[PDB]
Amino acid sequence: LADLFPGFGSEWINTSSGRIFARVGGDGPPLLLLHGFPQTHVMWHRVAPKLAERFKVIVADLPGYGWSDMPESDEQHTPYTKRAMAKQLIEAMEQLGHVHFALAGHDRGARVSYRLALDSPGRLSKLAVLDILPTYEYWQRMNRAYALKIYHWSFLAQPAPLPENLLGGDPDFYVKAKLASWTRAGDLSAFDPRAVEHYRIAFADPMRRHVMCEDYRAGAYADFEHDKIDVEAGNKIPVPMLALWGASGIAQSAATPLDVWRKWASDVQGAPIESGHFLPEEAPDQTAEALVRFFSA
Amino acid sequence: DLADLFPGFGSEWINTSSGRIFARVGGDGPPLLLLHGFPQTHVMWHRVAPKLAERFKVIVADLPGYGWSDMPESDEQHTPYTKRAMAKQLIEAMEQLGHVHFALAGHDRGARVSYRLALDSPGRLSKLAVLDILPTYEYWQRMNRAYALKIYHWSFLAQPAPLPENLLGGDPDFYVKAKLASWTRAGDLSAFDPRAVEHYRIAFADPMRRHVMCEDYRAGAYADFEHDKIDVEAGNKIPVPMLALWGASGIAQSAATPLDVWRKWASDVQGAPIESGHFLPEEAPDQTAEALVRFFSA
Ligand SMILES: [Ca+2]
Numbered sequence A: 001l002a003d004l005f006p007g008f009g010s011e012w013i014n015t016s017s018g019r020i021f022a023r024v025g026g027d028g029p030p031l032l033l034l035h036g037f038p039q040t041h042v043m044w045h046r047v048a049p050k051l052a053e054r055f056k057v058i059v060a061d062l063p064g065y066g067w068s069d070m071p072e073s074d075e076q077h078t079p080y081t082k083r084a085m086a087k088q089l090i091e092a093m094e095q096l097g098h099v100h101f102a103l104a105g106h107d108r109g110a111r112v113s114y115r116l117a118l119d120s121p122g123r124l125s126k127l128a129v130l131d132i133l134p135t136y137e138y139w140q141r142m143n144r145a146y147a148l149k150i151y152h153w154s155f156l157a158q159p160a161p162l163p164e165n166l167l168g169g170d171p172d173f174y175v176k177a178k179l180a181s182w183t184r185a186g187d188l189s190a191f192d193p194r195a196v197e198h199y200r201i202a203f204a205d206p207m208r209r210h211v212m213c214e215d216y217r218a219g220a221y222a223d224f225e226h227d228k229i230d231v232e233a234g235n236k237i238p239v240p241m242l243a244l245w246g247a248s249g250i251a252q253s254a255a256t257p258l259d260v261w262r263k264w265a266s267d268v269q270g271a272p273i274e275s276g277h278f279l280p281e282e283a284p285d286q287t288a289e290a291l292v293r294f295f296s297a
Numbered sequence B: 001d002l003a004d005l006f007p008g009f010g011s012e013w014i015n016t017s018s019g020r021i022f023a024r025v026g027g028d029g030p031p032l033l034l035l036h037g038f039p040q041t042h043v044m045w046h047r048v049a050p051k052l053a054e055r056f057k058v059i060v061a062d063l064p065g066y067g068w069s070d071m072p073e074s075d076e077q078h079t080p081y082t083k084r085a086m087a088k089q090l091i092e093a094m095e096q097l098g099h100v101h102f103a104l105a106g107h108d109r110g111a112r113v114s115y116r117l118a119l120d121s122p123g124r125l126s127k128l129a130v131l132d133i134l135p136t137y138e139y140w141q142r143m144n145r146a147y148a149l150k151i152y153h154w155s156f157l158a159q160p161a162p163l164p165e166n167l168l169g170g171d172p173d174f175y176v177k178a179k180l181a182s183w184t185r186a187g188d189l190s191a192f193d194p195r196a197v198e199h200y201r202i203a204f205a206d207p208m209r210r211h212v213m214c215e216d217y218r219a220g221a222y223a224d225f226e227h228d229k230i231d232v233e234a235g236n237k238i239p240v241p242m243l244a245l246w247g248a249s250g251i252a253q254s255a256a257t258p259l260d261v262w263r264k265w266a267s268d269v270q271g272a273p274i275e276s277g278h279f280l281p282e283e284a285p286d287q288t289a290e291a292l293v294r295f296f297s298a
Helices: A047-051 A082-095 A108-119 A135-140 A144-149 A160-167 A171-182 A193-204 A206-220 A222-233 A258-265 A284-296 B084-095 B109-120 B138-141 B145-150 B163-168 B174-181 B194-204 B207-221 B223-234 B256-262 B283-297
Strands: A009-013 A020-026 A028-033 A058-061 A099-105 A124-130 A241-246 A268-273 B009-014 B021-026 B031-035 B057-061 B102-107 B125-131 B240-248 B269-274
Touching: A020 A047, A020 A082, A020 B031, A028 A047, A028 A082, A028 A108, A047 A058, A047 A284, A058 A082, A082 A108, A082 A222, A099 A284, A108 A124, A108 A206, A108 A222, A108 B021, A124 A284, A135 A222, A135 B145, A160 A206, A160 B163, A171 A193, A171 B163, A193 A206, A206 A222, A222 A241, A222 A258, A241 A258, A241 A284, A258 A268, A268 A284, B021 B084, B031 B084, B031 B109, B057 B084, B084 B109, B084 B223, B102 B109, B109 B207, B109 B223, B125 B283, B138 B223, B145 B194, B163 B207, B174 B194, B194 B207, B207 B223, B240 B256, B240 B283, B256 B269, B269 B283
Parallel strands: A028 A058, A028 A099, A099 A124, A124 A241, A241 A268, B031 B057, B031 B102, B102 B125, B125 B240, B240 B269
Antiparallel strands: A009 A020, A020 A058, B009 B021, B021 B057
8 A cells, every 4th residue: 555645654543542643744734634435534635735834733533434443332422423433533533642733624524624613612723624514514405406416325324234335345346426416527536546545445444334335324314313402502613714615516516515514614715626525536636726725815 | 956935826027018927826726916025025925825726827937037037138218117118018928918907916126127117007906005105206206214224225236337347246145045044034034935045045046137136226215216107206006905014114114204205106005013023024924925815805
């Protein structure tokens, strides 16, 4: 497996919920980058060096993903709720001495990120979320067209071992299908093949796949419930935040992303990037430039 | 190796322009077509068909592309697996038997064929029974978080090929048993005759059969929905007397009445809950049989 972050250190950060793996590079204010599904930290390999010129970039595998330890789940999928994940990452950052840091997340990592910002906003200087709406918003907009487009939200949330048994027949196909289907081009051409290798190898582990389903089960239940409480209480993210989304991406599929985030965040700017879901790999220059400018503010 | 679950029923291969329909045929009297759904075959009727055969010529057919019926080759619009096309094929199949006016009971996908038949060609039907469904349009209009999780397979199997095909191939035995078990009231396979499960398992083991089922669900997400939508917007109602049976723990029920929903679609509909999960004729065979005999006799 290729090192896609030449010059970046490698940290195994111990937490009470297991070790967080992270590539660490650059200097300056701490910036935590969180990948999503079905990826690992290496999806930032095209934008992290650019950020590393101005920030201490911490590129972490989510709890349960990539090389991070996999906390044993439970009946409520607790360790893979975004609330628990955010707690674990806060702990991880504290092990490095970062108690106040900037955060950019994509996909599942973006969900950890806004949940972190709701639960523990004092930990965040600024927050960027890439190609998501809040989990609550996806579910609330889950009509026919949206159920078809993000079917995996209900499929991977099915009780164990139903998704796991089906994914186990041909894990390579599924990880490649999900990568391809959500690019602007609809194929794997936006990805570095050595990165695809990282994604493929992570997905080949049956426990890693279970964890991804657990993440999606949390996404269907506890994560939804946590968000529901916040939106129905009018709890807004007080951290300055950037919402970036792909013009051909998931977030814009069933809502105007900046409109939705303005319901969730008191101080949100948004920009579309010509790209599918995988902004940091499909449109690395445009994404890194948006992130550098936002976080330099 | 595959048990004959319809003692006294013959077997017909009925020729249609789109391929052969397989059916078990038993009884005498008015013709009654029974249509299974997913992921079953005609054998799901094995506990109630003998009851109905006391009073009716019971024709227990595998849907087009299901079971032992031929699989017409699909196209870009999944046309042969739309309920409209399936209904046209079964209308032709019944015509081959001299049945141009018949009673009809369908469960699951077969109930979808059945009410679409009733909408398109109401004069073909004396009476209609639908087991544990709402119209396809209604499922999609009610698509929310809760329903998306419950009938996830409606969007999963409608994914463009070969995504569900490939995943279904990962563990087809588990999948069909899981679908059967998870929609019963018990949550296991104890409601089913093990010889019936063997039929469902063996049908599900053929990748071509699984592909057809996905085509059926692709139709269910697209053409089928659009056909239903037109009838909704035109105010077209099913005019044949209709019986809607649903499991108290089935798919059709939720918070609002299945019967209140069917009244929007049919002008003459009666409805009863059955203590049952989704698979009324196997989970509650005599309560289902009694409801069907009482209704179809009139
Ligand atoms: Ca297996």
